[PDB]
Amino acid sequence: TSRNFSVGREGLEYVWGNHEPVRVWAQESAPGDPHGWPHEIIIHYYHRHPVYTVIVLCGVALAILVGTASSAACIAKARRDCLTPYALAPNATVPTALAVLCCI
Amino acid sequence: FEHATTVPNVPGIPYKALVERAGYAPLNLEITVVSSELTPSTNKEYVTCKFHTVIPSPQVKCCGSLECKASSKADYTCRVFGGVYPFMWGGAQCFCDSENTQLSEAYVEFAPDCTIDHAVALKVHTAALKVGLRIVYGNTTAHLDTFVNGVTPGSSRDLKVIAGPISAAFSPFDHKVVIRKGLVYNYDFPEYGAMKPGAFGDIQASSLYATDIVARTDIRLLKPSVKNIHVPYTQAVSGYEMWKNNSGRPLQETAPFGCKIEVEPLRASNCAYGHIPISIDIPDAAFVRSSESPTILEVSCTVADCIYSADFGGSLTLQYKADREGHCPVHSHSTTAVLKEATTHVTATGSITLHFSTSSPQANFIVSLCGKKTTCNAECKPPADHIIGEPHKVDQEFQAAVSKTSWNWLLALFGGASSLIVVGLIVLVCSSMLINTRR
């Protein structure tokens, strides 16, 4: 027969019949390269610590998303608070010098 | 001198420390836990084994009445039956017809083979850790055994090492333990005096040759039916035999932390758990002045190739220039990298190749050659073998465990997120005073 046993960093001891106990430890020989491109980095760290890698990748995606939304909102309200007051006020004229400096 | 080190309690991996005092050359220290003992305080509740049902020779009164008496033997059951007329080989044994009375007795003894086949019920209190050390300072090696309690000065000759309290209190034994033929079981045995028929401990005694045996084996004495003389009885099974059939696996195979459970005395040897705060008092003869010790002028560390594995999967050559011959100790001032060799022979101008083990995916540690520490840079590839037969010499951190390329990617993305926030804020304020100046 064949039996499958999970070995961690701490080790595993198996005794087969009247044999001396034999101990085996597990190394981080995860598929991928931690020093290569980002996707091999991701494969390595996912195969090593999956939940930690998922948490970190979700955190970085959240960090980019809130911050892209924040920059977009800041540029948006700045654009509107520069455009609505007098740039496009009724019967109001804004020449090139203070129009093209940011507009279009 | 006093050195406060935290030696991980794993039996076989030396912990390399560097004790340095002002005006003296650094001294290499090596604390190895050759052995460990977890001895708990025990209390023998009782002794149990298979019981032998002693049925004495029946007593019959031919024309008269018999009375049950009180006896102190284990599970002494007595009953008196009304009309018997018993027969032996030779005919009837009484002259009356139905006024004959029988007295059935049945108690419980210890089986003759119980001197070898018996179980000891024990209660174990707090445990004591007693470790053996191989402290190496300079070129003198001291072997000593010390109690890990925080106050005991366990010293071999003059070392004066004090092992502080263990960080975590761990015991493979719970409150109640059963020892049978060298095997150790964690069983909730019945207390002394409360024995249940058909279960472990149905017969109890303070010793094998004690006279105060107590038992409860459910001996029911039945009415004789055949004409021949007979004490008919029915009884529960041996709780010892039932427990032997349903014993499970011993603590010798179910113990955590890879402990070796041993008896006489009961102990758990070579357990790998926690940290031992060892404080050492090195004799002044070991230390040497800096004047007559070799002095390094320029040391540069280059690491050829490395992997992060349990063994010494790393190479580290360093080119130094020193003024004199001698032996200068080396040390890695990093928790993620350790060095196989500690003392190196210095030959004026030259190089020495030092093997190291690391668990971070990088050699980014500081190596001191009797002073003048230098930094090392490398990339440590993942190992080839998946399973190794040797413990990991270094514990796994987080900042170490994340590589510099991954750190750069994460830092770049998070810093871009922060730069978006700050550029949004500066644009917001720019527009704010723009509006303020507009009106």
UniProtKB/Swiss-Prot annotation, chain A:
It is a single-pass type I membrane protein. The chain crosses the membrane at residues 55-75. Disulfide bonds join 82-103. Glycans are attached at residue 4. It is found in: Virion membrane; Host cell membrane. Residues 84-104 are annotated as: Transient transmembrane before p62-6K protein processing. Residues 77-81 are annotated as: Interaction with the capsid protein. Plays an essential role in viral attachment to target host cell, by binding to the cell receptor PCDH10. Some specific strains may also bind host receptors VLDLR and LRP8/APOER2. Synthesized as a pE2 precursor which is processed by furin at the cell membrane just before virion budding, giving rise to E2-E1 heterodimer. The pE2-E1 heterodimer is stable, whereas E2-E1 is unstable and dissociate at low pH. pE2 is processed at the last step, presumably to avoid E1 fusion activation before its final export to cell surface. Interacts with spike glycoprotein E1. Processing of the precursor of protein E3/E2 into E2 and E3 results in a heterodimer of the spike glycoproteins E2 and E1. Spike at virion surface are constituted of a trimer of E2-E1 heterodimers. Interacts with 6K protein. The E2-E1 heterodimer interacts with host PCDH10 (via domain Cadherin 1); this interaction mediates viral entry to the host cell. This is Spike glycoprotein E2. It comes from Western equine encephalitis virus. The chain holds residues 634 to 737 of 1236 of the full protein.
Curated annotation (Swiss-Prot), chain B:
N-glycosylated. It comes from the Viruses. It is a single-pass type I membrane protein. Residues 13-408 are extracellular. Glycans are attached at residues 139, 245, 270. Residues 84-101 are annotated as: E1 fusion peptide loop. The chain crosses the membrane at residues 409-429. Residues 430-439 are cytoplasmic. It is found in: Virion membrane; Host cell membrane. Disulfide bonds join 49-114, 62-94, 63-96, 68-78, 259-271, 301-376, 306-380, 328-370. Interacts with spike glycoprotein E2. The precursor of protein E3/E2 and E1 form a heterodimer shortly after synthesis. Processing of the precursor of protein E3/E2 into E2 and E3 results in a heterodimer of the spike glycoproteins E2 and E1. Spike at virion surface are constituted of three E2-E1 heterodimers. After target cell attachment and endocytosis, E1 change conformation to form homotrimers. Interacts with 6K protein. Class II viral fusion protein. Fusion activity is inactive as long as E1 is bound to E2 in mature virion. After virus attachment to target cell receptor PCDH10 and endocytosis, acidification of the endosome induce dissociation of E1/E2 heterodimer and concomitant trimerization of the E1 subunits. This E1 trimer is fusion active, and promotes release of viral nucleocapsid in cytoplasm after endosome and viral membrane fusion. Efficient fusion requires the presence of cholesterol and sphingolipid in the target membrane. This is Spike glycoprotein E1. It comes from Western equine encephalitis virus.
